[PDB]
C-alpha cells in the first residue's frame, strides 16, 4: 500500500540518481560503478511499481502517481543498463 510505495520510491530515486551522476561524468573507467548502482535502483523500482495499492482516496492516488513515474524511469534504466 502507500507506505511501501513511498519507501521504494525514495530508495530507487537515490540509487538511480547516483548511477546517473557517475554515468554523466565524462571521465572514463567508471561505468562499472554506474552499472552496480543502476542494478540497485532497478530492483527498487520493480518492487515499488508492483506494490499493490487498493481502493481510492488521496494517498492511494498519490502512490499510484509515483508508481507511474517509476515505471517510465524503469524502462529507461533497463535500456541504459544493456549498453554498459
Amino acid at each position: 500500500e502507500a507506505e511501501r510505495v513511498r519507501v521504494f520510491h525514495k530508495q530507487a530515486f537515490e540509487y538511480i540518481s547516483i548511477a546517473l551522476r557517475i554515468d554523466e561524468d565524462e571521465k572514463a573507467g567508471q561505468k562499472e560503478q554506474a552499472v552496480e548502482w543502476y542494478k540497485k535502483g532497478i530492483e527498487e523500482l520493480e518492487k515499488g511499481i508492483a506494490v499493490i495499492v487498493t481502493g481510492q482516496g488521496e494517498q492511494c492516488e498519490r502512490a499510484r502517481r509515483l508508481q507511474a513515474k517509476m515505471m517510465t524511469n524503469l524502462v529507461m534504466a533497463k535500456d541504459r543498463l544493456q549498453l554498459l
Partner: peptide, 18 residues
C-alpha cells in the same frame, strides 16, 4: 522540484549521446 520524470529526461540526454 526534481522527480522521477526529471531523472527520465537525464536518461534521454544520455541516450542522445549514444
Amino acid at each position: 522540484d526534481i522527480d522521477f520524470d526529471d531523472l527520465s529526461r537525464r536518461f534521454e540526454e544520455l541516450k542522445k549521446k549514444t
